[PDB]
Protein: 4-oxalocrotonate decarboxylase NahK
Organism: Pseudomonas putida
Amino acid sequence: NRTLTREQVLALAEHIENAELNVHDIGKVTNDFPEMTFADAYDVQWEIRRRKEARGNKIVGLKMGLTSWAKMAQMGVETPIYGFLADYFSVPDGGVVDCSKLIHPKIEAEISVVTKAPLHGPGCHLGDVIAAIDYVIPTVEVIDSRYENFKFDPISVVADNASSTRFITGGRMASLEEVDLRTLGVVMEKNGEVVELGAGAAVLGHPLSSVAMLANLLAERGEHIPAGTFIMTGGITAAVPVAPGDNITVRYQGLGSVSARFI
Ligand SMILES: [Cl-]
Ligand SMILES: [Cl-]
Ligand SMILES: [Mg+2]
């Protein structure tokens, strides 16, 4: 189920990460390696993780992509995808994002959770996740595909760490008792303009299910979700471009707001 040699994985991971580190967009790697499988792409992504860990970055969480059934079908995929978060991805609520360090960033409103118990697959589901949640926390992701290409290419995107680049936690944390995630309304404003609306159920029908899918995806590689893991469950709103000078504020129903300033 793999077509990349070890040397190719290592080279691809270096190439792709270099696009992020040097803020330089590249051609999607599936154009040069069309035989690349998702397993290949995850091999590349996890090698990027190791590259970051090797230079001392902490891996501080995981994020989900393609958490819309409709988008999955249109991307021809059967499950979401995931990526990892590095420490330097983190932006404090109200904080600054330096667009000169990014290629073509977009933001999306999400709900993250931190688990208090381990989750594993296969066959993990909502019941398991619900019992394992410590708290939830409003989070806006800044995603930035390192590819110059227009059309989404899920295998390339996976290899590019699911386009992860920054995340902004904010608003108020709550326990699952205090929030109904399916009906959790989200309003994204950019420069004062309401640009996107969404409700938590836009993530699979239930945002917490994304965490179960994450556990099941991880199980395929003999991995699981340790207790204490921070997971961004997926895009509640469509992704919205941001540019220097933009200020954004995402309002979470009953959970305050997340904001960020782009320069
Ligand atoms: Cl090794
Ligand atoms: Cl930054
Ligand atoms: Mg995201």
